[PDB]
């Protein structure tokens with residue numbers, strides 16, 4: 001019922017994500033010189049360095065907000081991909097599975113702690 005515990009849990013999950021080779025395309029903002037049409041398709045860029053910086057700045061109130069931004073990383077990859085078989089997209093799907101497997105307890109524990117707080 002620790003309603004702050006999510007933040008360090010998300011820090012250590014981001015650490016694992018940064019160690020994963022599948023995160024390499026997503027660690028920093030998509031390079032617009034490499035992908036000159038990126039902003040014609042993607043309205044809101046997102047990447048794991050921006051998520052970590054937002055967390056570390058104290059600019060997430062909840063792990064749901066962090067989860068929305070991480071899911072945006074993956075939806076951007078799916079929207080930008082020219083193929084469901086593309087390499088960088090395929091890395092997104094594995095990393096998404098890894099993230100969802102790990103974030104589920106963080107969300108559950110936070111929402112439980114907050115329900116207890118408001119009981």
Ligand SMILES: O=C(NCC1CC1)N1CCN(C(=O)c2ccc(Cl)o2)CC1
Pocket residue numbers: 024025026027028029030031034035076077078080081082086088089092
């Ligand atoms: O340039 C990138 N990464 C920046 C480096 C500094 C970390 N991109 C990753 C996100 N992108 C996609 O999700 C995608 C899907 C299919 C294809 Cl191809 O690209 C665009 C390419």
